[PDB]
UniProtKB/Swiss-Prot annotation:
Gene coding for it: bla
Residues noted as binding substrate in the record, renumbered to the chain: K206, T207, G208
Quaternary structure and partners: Monomer.
Protein name: Beta-lactamase Toho-1
Note: The class A beta-lactamase family has a specific amino-acid numbering system, sometimes called Ambler or ABL numbering and often misspelt as Amber. A multiple sequence alignment was used to derive a consensus sequence and then the consensus was numbered taking into account insertions and deletions. This allows use of identical numbers, e.g. for active site residues, despite differences in protein length. UniProt always uses natural numbering of residues, hence there appear to be differences in numbering between this entry and some papers.
Function as written in the Swiss-Prot or TrEMBL entry: Has strong cefotaxime-hydrolyzing activity.
PANTHER family, alphabetized: BETA-LACTAMASE (PTHR35333), BETA-LACTAMASE-TYPE TRANSPEPTIDASE FOLD CONTAINING PROTEIN (PTHR35333:SF3)
UniProt superkingdom: Bacteria
Gene Ontology MF: a single term: beta-lactamase activity
Keywords: Antibiotic resistance, Hydrolase, Plasmid, Signal
Length: 260
């Protein structure tokens, strides 16, 4: 029956909906187009920060290393990075900026630091993720052209991986709780998955929108009396200049967690 509400939603939205919920209590799943590739957009920014956290395990000084922010670094959306022009920003500061405020300059600084988009993919691989693939930097990794496999993953590959990063064995404890603290403090997920859930529940998430009306959100949920839920809602549309649809993610979240 849940299959019927998500198929109705999708059809009326005139788009293509993906969803991958993993109820950790019993590891049961609720999958809709979960093995189909969607353009991650700014949800990919979670993998770039966790790859820098995984580093700090072996390098205790790493996160405090400062990073010079200049004008010619500034890409299109730099809500935090721009304040620090002619200043610095440590690596922990750029991970928090990329996730909580979705700073693109910050996302680009982390990548360069690693060595390029292909390193962040190699990291995904080391977590057991064979689907994820970051090809480009900001802002071009959001074109979200249909069929294009660049910078795409699947809703289930992203649900399984997010679970391991925030509730699993991907990161040492210290780094896991820092990734989780970062996600919770997010400032952009208001209208998305969070909307479709009870106000009392706790949520750390990262959105991702792009062209072709691409609207994504990946969130770890902590019910008040239940084990955590991992929810990945990917949505995209056929028209390049299609409006983004967060209300579709709020709806889908409601539909799938209608039972907890």
């Amino acid at each position: 029956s849940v299959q019927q509400q998500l198929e109705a939603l999708e059809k009326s939205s005139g788009g293509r909906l993906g969803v991958a919920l993993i109820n950790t209590a019993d590891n049961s799943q609720i999958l809709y187009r979960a093995d189909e590739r969607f353009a991650m957009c700014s949800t990919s920014k979670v993998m770039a920060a966790a790859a820098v956290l995984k580093q700090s395990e072996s390098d205790k000084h790493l996160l405090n290393q400062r990073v010079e922010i200049k004008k010619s670094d500034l890409v299109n959306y730099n809500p935090i990075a721009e304040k620090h022009v002619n200043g610095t920003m440590t690596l922990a500061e750029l991970g928090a900026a990329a996730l909580q405020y979705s700073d693109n300059t910050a996302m680009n600084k982390l990548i360069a630091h690693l060595g390029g988009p292909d390193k962040v993919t190699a990291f995904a691989r080391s977590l057991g993720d064979e689907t994820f693939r970051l090809d480009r930097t900001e802002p071009t990794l959001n074109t979200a052209i249909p069929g294009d496999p660049r910078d795409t993953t699947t809703p289930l590959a992203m649900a399984q991986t997010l679970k391991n990063l925030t509730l699993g064995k991907a990161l040492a404890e210290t780094q896991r709780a820092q990734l989780v603290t970062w996600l919770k403090g997010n400032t952009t997920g208001s209208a998305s998955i969070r909307a479709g859930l009870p106000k009392s529940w706790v949520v750390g998430d990262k959105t991702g929108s792009g062209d072709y009306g691409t609207t994504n959100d990946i969130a770890v949920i902590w019910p008040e009396n239940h084990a955590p839920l991992v929810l990945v809602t990917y949505f995209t549309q056929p028209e390049q200049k299609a409006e983004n649809r967060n209300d579709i993610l709020a709806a889908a979240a409601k539909i799938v967690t209608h039972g907890f």
